[PDB]
């Protein structure tokens, strides 16, 4: 795309390892840091996709 093909997403942050041959579709927020993450998505919160 001339601007960018924003149709593909890749997961970056996961809790732990991954077994062979499974899928992990989960539209969540990464509960990092001490403060309870509430979909803030700012610092200490991360959108895994």
């Amino acid at each position: 795309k001339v601007s960018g093909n924003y149709n593909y997403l890749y997961r970056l942050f996961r809790k732990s390892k991954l077994k062979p041959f499974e899928r992990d579709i989960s539209t969540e927020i990464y509960q990092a840091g001490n403060k309870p993450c509430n979909g803030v998505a700012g610092f200490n919160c991360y959108f895994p996709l």
């Binding site: 077994k19 041959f21 499974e22 899928r23």
Partner: protein
Amino acid sequence: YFKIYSKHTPVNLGRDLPQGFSALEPLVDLPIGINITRFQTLLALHRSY
């Protein structure tokens, strides 16, 4: 490939788990691709005795 090993009984006499040997014969399977969380069952609640 859901395992469904099963077998019918010829000579059950109505008592809890009679002693003996009898194997099981698979019928069919199905791929799933998910992981394990819990289990639950339910019978036909429209009639029970």
